[PDB]
């Protein structure tokens, strides 16, 4: 897999951001994760976490997997990195997302995320508390 440049246009929520990719605005949906919706428990905290992470980053990168690059809603499907740290992984490690939506051919980082989830669960973090 390869990291490619993008620039933040707007944080949206725990699962998505508006990013400029190849000079075109796009909603990106994070691969392999599910954050609570804003009206659910830890939903606001997941959105706040991603917002800070991406807004504070000097460099945003997107990493597509081997399979579908866009979903049925026209959202890009990627691993998102903020100054080299994967936001997808960071969310799961803090118990602000579950590993979810694991489809064959778009699951390169599945085991990394599951390890992170196991640690959040062991620590009884946020969703796991
Ligand atoms: C994360 C992800 C979601 N999606 C689709 C499946 C779900 O369809 P449905 O909308 O029919 O439930 C939806 C979940 O996204 P959200 O969790 O952002 O709603 O997005 C994919 O198709 N591929 C993916 O990798
Ligand atoms: Ca969601």
- Enumerate the domain spans of the chain: 3-128
Task: Give the burial string for 36-71 (b: 16+ CB within 10 Å, else e).
Answer: beeeeebbebbbebbbebbeebeebbbbbbeeeeee
> Pick the catalytic residue: 17, 29, 30, 61?
29
Q: Candidates 3.40.50.300, 2.40.50.90, 3.30.930.10, 3.30.230.10; correct CATH number of 3-128?
A: 2.40.50.90
Q: Are 18 and 81 in contact (CB under 8 A)?
A: no
Name the nearest CA neighbour of 117 among 34, 27, 50, 51.
34
- Decide if 29 is catalytic: yes
Resolution to one decimal, Å: 1.9
- Decide if 69 is catalytic: no
Q: Are 36 and 127 in contact (CB under 8 A)?
A: yes
- Decide if 30 is catalytic: no
Quick one: 9 exposed, middle or buried, by C-beta within 10 A (0-12, 13-18, 19+)?
Answer: middle
Breaks (C-N over 2.5 A) in the chain follow: none
Paired tokens of 109: 């980082």
Paired tokens of 8: 């933040």
- CA dist list (Å): 34 to 83, 112, 116: 22, 15, 14
Ligand 2 ion local residues (Cβ < 5 A): 15, 34
């Amino acid at each position: 897999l390869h990291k490619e440049p993008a620039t933040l246009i707007k944080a949206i929520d725990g699962d998505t951001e508006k990013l400029m990719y190849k000079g075109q605005p796009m909603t990106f949906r994070r691969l392999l994760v599910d954050t609570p919706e804003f009206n659910e428990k830890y939903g606001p905290e997941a959105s706040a976490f991603t917002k800070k992470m991406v807004e504070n980053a000097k460099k945003i990168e997107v990493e597509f997997d081997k399979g579908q690059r866009t979903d049925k809603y026209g959202r890009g499907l990627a691993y998102i990195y903020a100054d080299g740290k994967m936001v997808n992984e960071a969310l799961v490690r803090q118990g602000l997302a579950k590993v979810a939506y694991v489809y064959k051919g778009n699951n390169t980082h599945e085991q990394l995320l599951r390890k992170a989830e196991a640690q959040a669960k062991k620590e009884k973090l946020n969703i796991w508390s």
